[PDB]
Amino acid sequence: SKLRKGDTVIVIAGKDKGKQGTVQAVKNDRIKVEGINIVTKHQKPNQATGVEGGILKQEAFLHISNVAILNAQTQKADRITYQFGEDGKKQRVYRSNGEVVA
Amino acid sequence: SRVCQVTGKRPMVGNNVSHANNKTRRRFLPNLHHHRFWVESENRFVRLRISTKGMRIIDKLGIDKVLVDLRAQGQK
Amino acid sequence: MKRTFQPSVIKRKRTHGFRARMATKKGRQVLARRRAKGRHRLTV
Amino acid sequence: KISELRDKSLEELTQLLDEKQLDAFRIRMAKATGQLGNTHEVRVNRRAIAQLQTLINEKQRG
Amino acid sequence: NNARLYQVLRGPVFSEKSQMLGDSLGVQVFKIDSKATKLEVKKAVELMFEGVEVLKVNTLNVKGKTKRFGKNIGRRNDYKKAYVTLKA
RNA sequence: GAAGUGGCAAAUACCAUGCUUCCAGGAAAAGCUUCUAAGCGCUAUAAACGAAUCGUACCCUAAACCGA
RNA sequence: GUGUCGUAAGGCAUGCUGGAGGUAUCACAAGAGCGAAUGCUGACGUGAGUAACGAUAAUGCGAGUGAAAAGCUCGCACGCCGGAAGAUCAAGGGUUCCAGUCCAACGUUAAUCGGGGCUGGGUGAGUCGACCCCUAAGGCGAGGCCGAAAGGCGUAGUCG
RNA sequence: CCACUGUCGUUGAAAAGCCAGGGGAUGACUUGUGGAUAGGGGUGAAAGGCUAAUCAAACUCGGUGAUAGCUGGUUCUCCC
RNA sequence: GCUUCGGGGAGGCGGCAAUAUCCUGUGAUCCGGAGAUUUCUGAAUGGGGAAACCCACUUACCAUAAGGUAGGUAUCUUGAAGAAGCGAACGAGGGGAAGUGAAACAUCUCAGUACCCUUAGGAAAAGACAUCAAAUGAGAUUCCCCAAGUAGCGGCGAGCGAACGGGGAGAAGCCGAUUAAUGCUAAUGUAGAAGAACAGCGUGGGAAAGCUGACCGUAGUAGGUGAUAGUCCUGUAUUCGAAACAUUAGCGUUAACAUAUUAAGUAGGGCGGGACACGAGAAAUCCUGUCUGAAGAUGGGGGGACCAUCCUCCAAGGCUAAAUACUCCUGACUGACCGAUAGUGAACCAGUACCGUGAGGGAAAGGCGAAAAGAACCCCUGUGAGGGGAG
Ligand SMILES: [Mg+2]
């Protein structure tokens, strides 16, 4: 919820701990980050639909608490906070420093 | 039903008691009779299913008083 | 040999049916009891 | 799309609803004869009909 | 009214009986609304197919079949179909 | 791309809700035909148009009903 | 499983399995200990690969298909019913009807077959039946009668 | 429609049948459909028969965990 | 699922359960308030009926054909308004067992219980003395602790079993302590918002665990996250939002009903019953089926037969909050409660399957993994089942 599809994060727990990528999907509590948590899928070929089949490599959802937003300046894991501006606009803000970007 | 209109008497429940004190459920019924009461104020006979006590109440209070009390009570 | 259940739709609906239940106070208590147990079949 | 219908008067809302009824009939016939690839359109037409009838109810009540 | 006739015809019937009825007698088979009368079917056909005349409508109710799927026993909807005879 | 009409036999079906007998004495109501009451359309001749709705598959001396 | 310790109930250690919990000590509280109750539930034995395979109307062969054919299809022959074991219904059932496809389970064997699975199809009415008009038995029953209450009866009627 | 005799069957093909015989078969006959009578009540050409495979008082639920001077069972260990 | 008003801000078109076409910063999905739509059956209400069906009558309008739209048409009560039906427990009322106990059994017990029937309200009922007491008197009703298993009752058996008074809770007395609306003011609830602080190293599939060193704390024993987290996520402490609607109070106002004036078929009595802890007893007191029947304040009721004296209180008009009873439900919280033969019958598509004509009876059945990464491809086999490799 604090992380939405598009922003660059860093996984802080799991087998891919340390690597960074950009979010592709957030279902409820899981998150899909490209290039991270790659599973090998044995796809049975299909005749009717257009899929081919083979041994694919695709990213899998991991737990959303296993990734952290990547600070663009410090290049380290960070937390998110919310800042209501004087204009009444709610913006995500880095917990470490506080800049509005991401 | 077996209810007096003017007094409200209805069957009572109780016990038949034998000499050996055996108890059986019994009823006590009102002494109810059909009677045509002459009403001068309407120049007519009105037939009531009334108890003996109700007939005495007619005697003491008047058919007009009893009739207005029944009409206030409802069924007429 | 002849057995106990000889089905007839009119006879079933006339002794046990919904309107037969609703015609009596005791049949309505049957229905209230079936609804309180939550039966998916109220009446035949 | 609801702002495009709220401005319209009842007299033309009724006629647009009738057009939508005929539209729904033809979508159904094309669906049965397998000539409607974009299958999302039947639901949007049904919900447009619902909107038109709601607005007609409003404009007739007051 | 002219908004009830738009719901009378639910769609055509495509089968071998329907195909050969169309070929031999030029009669259209429709799945119709469960509550439509022969007069309503006649009016709906004549309104939705401009230029045709209806001689005869034959209707029938067909009960839906029971198809146990997965763990459940369920049944398909009943439906009504109309055989409509048109002017040659 | 043929024939398709003569004899005889013959039902428990039909005439027949008849006929004859008996006593144990043999539904009802409506449709239908007439009559009028209060009150104020009907009969012929046709011509056109109609006759809705539900059922109709299949078993049924049975492997489909009643008997687990 | 093993080793070891205690009079016993039992304790301790440890190999293997297992993969996320457990609990010293001292108190405290018990759904606190099972072999029996023709105990209760589930699982699995013995009987035993035993009895039986449901009318003694009956089958033989050639082709076909198939992984496979006594049982399916086709053919020839044989046999059985024929006031039915044929045909039409009502009642009851409810898709079992027809085609294609499948053979695990179901079918007392096998099954390519099926009333089995799956997918499609199929029921067409002014005249047939229902509905409808009418009433029987018998119901219900404005008012009415009766009855502690609940209710019971009953006229006109209204159903059937 | 019935059910007199026998064999069979008795973990049946069947919780009352089969087979071979047997009785009534225009009548106090059989049978369809609908209805009526309800538990100390019904109904009974009377056997205490029948009243849904239940009848010297149906079935279901409830009083109810009836009562049972009776039968069965009653679970770890050691010491006196 | 349609409209609107608020919330919210990136995904979404309910689950099994995915796929497709798509929607979404022109603010979707989602959440909260309001509205619109709302088939047929069922009180079912136009008549009827084997519930989900059959058959209508009528008014207005439209159509010209065989109809369509919008209505109306049940019964009863009260003088147009109401009612009906359903649904937990608790209340009040009309009827009212038996098993059982008495080591039999009939009085008695069980028990005014079960059950049947009627009908309310958030409670109901009762309630202001024609009550007790006998003390220096107290001062309505209800409920709790005592009194007390006492005094009594009782085939004086089995059993049943008070009161006076004391200590508490709560308190209130009236004659309009009624009901329903509407309108203000306040408060609440029904969506929400922000919300601190952790790194390194080693092991490990994975770190939250180990070692080292930090930080927050009005937030440290919450649920998760690939093993055990105050600092990763959701949260927690704390501070907080309402366009709309509800609810609670206070106020004001309306319209419905009510507003006794001191009580005769009454008190008392005979007979038969019932209730009183009290079973006829020496039996007061209460209730009444039957038959009777006063005095009316210079009078009457009670003080456990009854009489006298003394005390006390005025029946035959009505009302009255709290303290008390309960849980079909809503919210928060809890547990030396269960953990799949347990705990609901029911953790699972359960009051289901199944059984029964029916009333009714009534199951079984949870767990891959952290993530489907649910095993591409090859081989045997009948394109089966099943397996062996590969992954
Ligand atoms: Mg019998």
What kind of experiment solved this structure? Answer: cryo-EM
Please enumerate in sequence order all residues whose Cβ is within 8 A of that of E28, keeping only pairs 6 or more positions apart, or say none: E12, E22, E45, E83, E84, E86
Element (H, E) at B45: strand B44-51
Mutate to test the interface with D, among E1, E2, E4, E6 (most CBs of D within 10 A): E6
The CA distance from D41 to E63, in Å, is 30
Would the Cβ of C19 be found within 7 angstroms of any atom in strand H? no
Residue type, A37: N
Tokens 């290049």 -> residue: A75
Contact D32 E48 (CB under 8 A): no
Angle among Cα A90, A95, A99 to the nearest 5 degrees reads: 60
Q: E9: nearest CA in chain D?
A: D25
CB–CB contact E12 D18 (8 Å): no
Within A1-102, residue ranges assigned H as helices are none
Return the beta strands (E) in A34-84 as ranges: 38-43, 54-59, 62-63, 67-70, 77-78, 80-84
Query: D32 contacts in E (CB within 8 Å)?
Result: 10-12, 31
Closest CA to B12 of B22, B25, B24, B23: B25
Indicate the angle between helix axes D10-32 and D41-61, nearest 10 degrees: 160
E9 to chain D: which residues are within 8 Å by CB?
Answer: 25, 29
E59 touches strand F (CB under 7 A): yes
Residue A71 is which amino acid?
N
Task: For tokens 């729904």, name the residue.
Answer: D24
